[PDB]
Amino acid sequence: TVPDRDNDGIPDSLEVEGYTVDVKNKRTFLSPWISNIHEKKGLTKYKSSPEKWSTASDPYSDFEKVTGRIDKNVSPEARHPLVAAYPIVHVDMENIILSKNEDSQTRTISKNTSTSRTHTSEVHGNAEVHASFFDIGGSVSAGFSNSNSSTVAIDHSLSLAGERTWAETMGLNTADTARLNANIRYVNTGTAPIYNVLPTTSLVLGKNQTLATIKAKENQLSQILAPNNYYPSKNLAPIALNAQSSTPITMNYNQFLELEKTKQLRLDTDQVYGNIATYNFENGRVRVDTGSNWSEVLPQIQETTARIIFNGKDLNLVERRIAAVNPSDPLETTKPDMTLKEALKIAFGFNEPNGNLQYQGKDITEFDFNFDQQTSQNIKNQLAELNATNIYTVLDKIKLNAKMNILIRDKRFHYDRNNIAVGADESVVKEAHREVINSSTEGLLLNIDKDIRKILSGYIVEIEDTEGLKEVINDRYDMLNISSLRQDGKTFIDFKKYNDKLPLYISNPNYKVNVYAVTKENTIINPSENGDTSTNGIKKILIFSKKGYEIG
Amino acid sequence: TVPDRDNDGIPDSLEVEGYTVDVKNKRTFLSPWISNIHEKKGLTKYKSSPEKWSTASDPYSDFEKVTGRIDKNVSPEARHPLVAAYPIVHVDMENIILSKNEDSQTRTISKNTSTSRTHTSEVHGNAEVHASFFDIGGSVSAGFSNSNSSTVAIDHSLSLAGERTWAETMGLNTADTARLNANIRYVNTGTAPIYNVLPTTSLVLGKNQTLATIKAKENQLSQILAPNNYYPSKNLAPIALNAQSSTPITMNYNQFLELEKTKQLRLDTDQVYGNIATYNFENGRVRVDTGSNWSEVLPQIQETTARIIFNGKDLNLVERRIAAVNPSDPLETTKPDMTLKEALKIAFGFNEPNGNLQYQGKDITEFDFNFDQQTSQNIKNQLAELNATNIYTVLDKIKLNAKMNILIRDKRFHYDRNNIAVGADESVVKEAHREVINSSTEGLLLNIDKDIRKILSGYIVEIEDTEGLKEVINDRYDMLNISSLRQDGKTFIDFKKYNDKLPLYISNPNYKVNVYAVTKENTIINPSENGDTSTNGIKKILIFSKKGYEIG
Numbered sequence A, B: 001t002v003p004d005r006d007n008d009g010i011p012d013s014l015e016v017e018g019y020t021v022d023v024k025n026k027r028t029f030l031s032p033w034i035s036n037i038h039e040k041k042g043l044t045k046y047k048s049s050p051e052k053w054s055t056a057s058d059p060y061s062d063f064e065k066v067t068g069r070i071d072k073n074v075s076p077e078a079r080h081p082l083v084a085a086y087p088i089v090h091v092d093m094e095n096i097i098l099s100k101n102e103d104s105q106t107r108t109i110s111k112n113t114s115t116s117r118t119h120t121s122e123v124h125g126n127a128e129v130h131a132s133f134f135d136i137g138g139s140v141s142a143g144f145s146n147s148n149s150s151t152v153a154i155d156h157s158l159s160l161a162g163e164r165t166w167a168e169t170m171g172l173n174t175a176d177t178a179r180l181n182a183n184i185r186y187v188n189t190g191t192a193p194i195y196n197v198l199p200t201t202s203l204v205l206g207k208n209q210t211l212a213t214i215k216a217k218e219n220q221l222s223q224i225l226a227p228n229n230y231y232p233s234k235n236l237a238p239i240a241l242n243a244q245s246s247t248p249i250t251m252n253y254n255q256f257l258e259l260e261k262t263k264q265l266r267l268d269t270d271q272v273y274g275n276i277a278t279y280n281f282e283n284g285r286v287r288v289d290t291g292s293n294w295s296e297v298l299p300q301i302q303e304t305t306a307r308i309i310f311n312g313k314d315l316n317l318v319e320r321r322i323a324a325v326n327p328s329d330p331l332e333t334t335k336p337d338m339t340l341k342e343a344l345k346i347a348f349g350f351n352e353p354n355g356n357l358q359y360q361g362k363d364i365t366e367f368d369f370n371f372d373q374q375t376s377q378n379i380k381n382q383l384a385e386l387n388a389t390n391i392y393t394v395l396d397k398i399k400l401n402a403k404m405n406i407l408i409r410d411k412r413f414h415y416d417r418n419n420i421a422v423g424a425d426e427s428v429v430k431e432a433h434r435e436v437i438n439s440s441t442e443g444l445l446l447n448i449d450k451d452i453r454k455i456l457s458g459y460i461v462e463i464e465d466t467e468g469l470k471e472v473i474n475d476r477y478d479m480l481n482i483s484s485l486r487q488d489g490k491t492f493i494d495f496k497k498y499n500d501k502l503p504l505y506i507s508n509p510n511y512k513v514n515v516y517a518v519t520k521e522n523t524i525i526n527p528s529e530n531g532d533t534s535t536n537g538i539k540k541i542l543i544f545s546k547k548g549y550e551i552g
């Protein structure tokens, strides 16, 4: 007869005053908090809400989570009563292949691609926006909202010899059509899995030119789209666009032209995910209830939580929602008060090693805090009634309210319009290369930092004469593609890839092999107004500079 | 009113402190462990978990198993509460038949094939892998994961007389298409059976060139895909690809060319298996519940167990999962602690004859232990807090945690990239042939070891002059096909198959009939850069060498 309105299985008090679970003999006991014996064994203080079957709203009873009696695929950090357990999928495009719409074998270009979830914010402050921008809900996207939108970029490097302008390469003239094709893979980034129907992602080019809308058959697949796990298992064959169909991908000269002008496409994905997999106390089985589909129980999550975009695990924007609270909602008050600090602890995993809220090493002060038009005030008003100018201090005293949005990104590197790892400062850059493993007339072998290397477009190999000459090897913007990468974790550079497949030429072993680095933000992808295919107008960074006798 | 949360029918204690079942009069009694009377009659100590309907997760109540009240097809070793009872099917291709896409009768090649489940691991340490390799879940296949992928090889031997280059044999020119066809059979290797819908296996060629996707109609068959039992009962007619259809298998000259260059295809199979067959206490019947399909209750197994790939029953990688435990999961702690030792006992059948954990004869020390990036540490940390360098010792003290992967393979033979019985050392090789049964001018009859013979491509028949000549009979790489095999278990060699159908020619009964053996790893399948169809560049092994008068 123990009091429990929620009916989830966690006696009100316990769920309000704090609780957790351990295993005596070999049984699981749900017991109240005990700062003593408990905080020692390493457990946690699971304080949830008594009036909600799942404080997060997601299809998983607070109990179901902590107890562990739930779909084993649910992300760990989501096994907690206050961490959203919803799926988030975006589309990755590994490589595309442009060809002249039907002896043709070399009349086709095939470049690789780099995809990465995005989170486009607002502009600077001049973009002419329609009057319907300062209305209620109208156009007020608050900078960023709910919707998955990935972004790919086409390898701007070379594929053949002296190729120039995809045009002449393929042979496309005004009255011609080019067919696009590519290999893409769905990949879940959230905290929950999808068991059947995948999303209906649409491929766009530019600001509205849709090139197609990919939505592979429903129920057709029984595979599982688990968290942090690419759909077509990385150990399988990546799905291929219109190539396995009766109407391919049409692209006219003008379009095919733009593609080259930016070498980038966009991928927007809906949210219609297959039904959900739930528990079943009776015989402890994992079933897919045709009666519960995210499309029903998902908006709630977004309407009663705090969203935080952090990028620590890598530079890829990771999303997570915490069980925040709303004042206007009685029920939503039954929720446990939330603090920005506590949040970053369960949401992603920040910890307090020696009393400093850091992340696997980095200090919470190494990341910039960016809020939306709303969240801004809601927090400003707190920093006010708390007398302070530094949030990193009163951090553990910031109340997170539902609908709150926060963007925690590493303060090291610079960021673009989509919030992507663009390129840091020369300082950090150089540092990452300070290490050397093997210098050769063939190519340098370094142990460059991953987090850094990801913001580098390429390297410019040159040679400075003992006087002051700037002779450069791969002098064409498209000759930056050199940096390789052994599976041992060491970046292997090669000068030979752009010098008649032959090693360096040292007429005088007293020169200076100057190998620079070019961050993405700086790198160029197309010739100048004229035909300057040179590395003249670039902002590279000195990464190497050894003498002729200081190599071999 | 006996305590039993799981509700499976095994009183908590019993299931935690150990239990088993026997038959008094003619009834089945579920009783607690008794080292005395019990361990004598030959029973076992079935220690399962009280909070899971089926500790393994599979659709079979711990009780249902031990009690025996379950689908009688379930593999024996799976009748145990801690051994996964899931199905695992891969596709075997007995023989293919290449022909020129539609007087044509000899313009067709028909070679046999050798299929075998695989388990592709990682490379050496240089394969340029995309940056998305050192991310979370991204590309981190951890070497090997969940997915069935078989591999076939095409008989590189001869079919006709002086045939050469399938090309001229069939008559395929640049502007031609070749149609492929073959006879394949589904075969279950797991521990559970499939009662209806078979898997959707896709036939691939190379690294991504899919030649077709076979998925015979659903419900079309009512036959059962029982464990260790080929689908189309070995005593029936093997299923045939596109041959019983409106769109065959297209293959252009360039492709048909590659096929010849490797003489091997790949077979990947999904996991969508038909619904499951469950019990029914009421009238003790075996029914197929449309409400429970593996696709629902199967991921769990892989998310809450230990996977061990052993190859003792043969050289074919056998998979099995044991009811391991996970620390982060309360429920999954209710499980019985697992030890690598105990595992290899129930998982495959290792036993302790005189105190040495061996397998049907071989000692646990005759197999190499290979773990994944994860499992490696999880075990290293144990060998650390246990002070030891040899795992074979502290074997019975290694805690197996869920998601753990282990590869136990015979240490005798060498292994490839797919973990297949390639070829051992000359030593072991020679040994297997030390036995002779009948020497003749026609062919040798031996009782070569099965485990060995499986790593042999063929034999080179030659004759050494009393001086030092190396005259070889079947001197062409494609003339290795000689070793036959009587159903009596004795390998019958024949020199006649490559000598005008006539027996040996002994001009001087004092020579040395040197018959070598060529392991798969060494054997060649195509001519050299030139046209060296000889056995010149080979690494054979001396298996025979008798005198002219020491035969007949």
Ligand SMILES: [Ca+2]
Binding pocket: A004, A006, A007, A008, A009, A010, A011, A012, A015, A049, A050
């Ligand atoms: Ca409750």
Ligand SMILES: [Ca+2]
Binding pocket: A006, A008, A015, A048, A049, A050, A051, A052, A053, A054, A055, A062
């Ligand atoms: Ca509750």
Ligand SMILES: [Ca+2]
Binding pocket: B004, B006, B007, B008, B009, B010, B011, B012, B015, B049, B050
């Ligand atoms: Ca029980």
Ligand SMILES: [Ca+2]
Binding pocket: B006, B008, B015, B048, B049, B050, B051, B052, B053, B054, B055, B062
């Ligand atoms: Ca049980």
